[PDB]
């Protein structure tokens, strides 16, 4: 049964709740972004409205094959009416097409649902700047002060430099990047751009990227592997046995892979900086981990919530145990007491 934190009070609206069957009372199903935990359940056989971003729309039509009529895309940053409820979609700074949703209730309550987000000061000069928000449904993925990680721009700097070094030292080395969903496209695109290449990938990954309205994308990617010295692979495949295997297939065209695993937080964030990163090495293959996050750090989250001063906070992540629930509330109280709301 759909949990209470996936429902919006005083509406027939639900948020990312596609995996329970029909939810009695729901007139409309919002989808925040195209990631399989959030969309789990959709198919070609859905005949209720889905509201989402244009980009999420394209992925629903082209990857899951939902029928064009039931996909209602909405522009961002635009006051829109949806069954006589004002809603706005805002960029969530997560993966491509990912949104937060502002709900303006009939009664006068205003609710913000973040979806998955990486909180940023640019959001403090958006449409949220204009009015009071009473309820916040919050992405709590990293709600604990251990969770620090660098800025995305720091990581992209590191990556660009590493790859450009090696390729210039050894012109027969291949760059590889791991992936399993949308998001983190800037990693492979920034690398490929510094190296004067297109990114090569499988047919299904090419199809996925062609839905994202990336500008000039036809110049940036290809399905021709031979012609490309930055390749993408399944994240499962990014290891020695799988990279060896793949290094065979290229047929004596490269003598060294230099791979990147963009990951989230790992425990090596607690003791090591980004400028002082190393890879594992089994011969001619060297695998970098790089903590490129598309979720709020503890401090970024803190700052956003303390600016917003919401009257009530409802967590959407790590709610499955009482210990996590209890721990999170403690931080919510400290924030509110420090800030005086
Ligand atoms: Ni996500």
Structure notes:
The protein is of the alpha/beta class. It has two domains: 1-147 and 296-341, Metallo-beta-lactamase, Chain A (4-Layer Sandwich); 148-295, 3-Layer(aba) Sandwich (Rossmann fold). The protein is built from eight helices and 18 strands. The strands form four sheets. It has a six-stranded mixed beta sheet with strand order 6-7-8-9-10-18. It has a five-stranded mixed beta sheet with strand order 1-2-3-4-5, covered by helices on one side. Strand 12, helix 5 (203-209) and strand 13 form a beta-alpha-beta unit. Helix 3 runs parallel beside helix 4. It is found in: Nucleus. Binds constitutively to TP53BP1. Binds CDC27, which is itself a component of the anaphase promoting complex (APC). Binds PIAS1. Belongs to the DNA repair metallo-beta-lactamase (DRMBL) family. This is DNA cross-link repair 1A protein.
Key words describing this protein structure:
about 350 residues, alpha/beta, Metallo-beta-lactamase, Chain A, Rossmann fold, 2 domains, 6-stranded mixed β-sheet, globular, binds nickel (II) ion
Please outline what is shown here.
By secondary structure, this protein is of the alpha/beta class.
Describe the secondary-structure layout.
Blueprint: E1 7-8, E2 13-15, E3 28-30, H1 36-39, E4 50-53, H2 54-64, E5 71-74, E6 80-81, E7 86-91, E8 99-104, E9 110-113, E10 135-138, H3 152-169, E11 173-179, H4 185-194, E12 199-200, H5 203-209, E13 221-222, E14 230-234, H6 240-249, E15 256-263, E16 279-281, E17 285-291, H7 298-308, E18 312-315, H8 322-339
Parallel strand pairs: 2-3, 3-4, 4-5, 9-10, 10-18, 11-14, 11-15, 12-13, 15-17
Antiparallel strand pairs: 1-2, 6-7, 7-8, 8-9, 16-17
The chain binds nickel (II) ion.
Organism: Homo sapiens
Subcellular location: Nucleus
Protein name: DNA cross-link repair 1A protein
């Amino acid at each position: 049964t759909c949990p209470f934190y996936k429902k919006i009070p005083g509406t027939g609206f639900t948020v990312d709740a596609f995996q329970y069957g029909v939810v009695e009372g729901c007139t409309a199903y919002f989808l925040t972004h195209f990631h399989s935990d959030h969309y789990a359940g959709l198919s070609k056989h859905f005949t209720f409205p889905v509201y989402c971003s244009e980009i999420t729309g394209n992925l629903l039509k082209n990857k899951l094959h939902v029928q064009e009529q039931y996909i209602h895309p909405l522009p961002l940053d635009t006051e829109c009416i949806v069954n006589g409820v004002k809603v706005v979609l805002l960029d969530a700074n997560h993966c491509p097409g990912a949104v937060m949703i502002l709900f303006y209730l009939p009664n006068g309550t205003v609710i913000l649902h973040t979806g998955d987000f990486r909180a940023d000061p640019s959001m403090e000069r958006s449409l949220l700047a204009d009015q009071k928000v009473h309820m916040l449904y919050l992405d709590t993925t990293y709600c604990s002060p251990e969770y620090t990680f660098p800025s995305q721009q720091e990581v992209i700097r590191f990556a660009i430099n590493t790859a450009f070094e090696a390729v210039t030292l050894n012109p027969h080395a291949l760059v590889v990047c791991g992936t399993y969903s949308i998001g983190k496209e800037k990693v492979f695109l920034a690398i490929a751009d510094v190296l004067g290449s297109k990114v090569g990938m499988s047919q299904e990954k090419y199809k996925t990227l062609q839905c994202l309205n990336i500008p000039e994308i036809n110049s940036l990617i290809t399905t021709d592997m031979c012609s490309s010295l930055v390749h993408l692979l399944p994240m499962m495949q990014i290891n020695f046995k799988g990279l060896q295997s793949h290094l065979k297939k290229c047929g004596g065209k490269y003598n060294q892979i230099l791979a990147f695993r963009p990951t989230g937080w790992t425990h090596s964030n607690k003791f090591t900086r980004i400028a002082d990163v190393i890879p594992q090495t089994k011969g001619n293959i060297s695998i970098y981990g790089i903590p490129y996050s598309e979720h709020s750090s503890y401090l970024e989250m803190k700052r956003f919530v303390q600016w917003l001063k919401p009257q009530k906070i409802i967590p959407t992540v790590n709610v499955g145990t009482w210990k996590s629930r209890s721990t999170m509330e403690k931080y919510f109280r400290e924030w509110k007491l420090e800030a005086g709301y």
